């Protein structure tokens, strides 16, 4: 019933603060639950269905 993650292509919004310090270590050891880690070729808009 809890809101889970999804990879639907959204019209993203450009923020201003960096979110780059202390990251690739952090999601490897659970800074926050329910992450998703993509590597390389999968940085694309997924297939959409309905």
């Amino acid at each position: 019933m809890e809101a889970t993650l999804e990879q639907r292509p959204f019209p993203y919004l450009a923020t201003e603060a960096n979110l780059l310090t202390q990251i690739k270590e952090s999601a490897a050891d659970g800074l926050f639950k329910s992450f998703q880690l993509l590597l390389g070729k999968d940085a694309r808009e997924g297939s959409v269905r309905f």
Binding site: N18, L20, T21, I23, K24, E25
Partner: protein, 50 residues
């Protein structure tokens, strides 16, 4: 006479305007950087932390 034929390009470049940090010590102005903003953001270890 040798001066213009020594810096053959470096007399005629348009002069730009840069922001950085300075200090006067003795008489020699020392610029101070810290290359970590380009090196913290990727988790490649910084080569100044030997």
């Amino acid at each position: 006479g040798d001066k213009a034929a020594l810096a053959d390009g470096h007399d005629e470049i348009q002069r730009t305007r840069i922001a950085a940090s300075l200090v006067k010590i003795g008489d020699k102005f020392v610029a101070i950087e810290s290359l970590q903003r380009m090196y913290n953001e990727t988790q490649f270890p910084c080569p100044l932390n030997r």
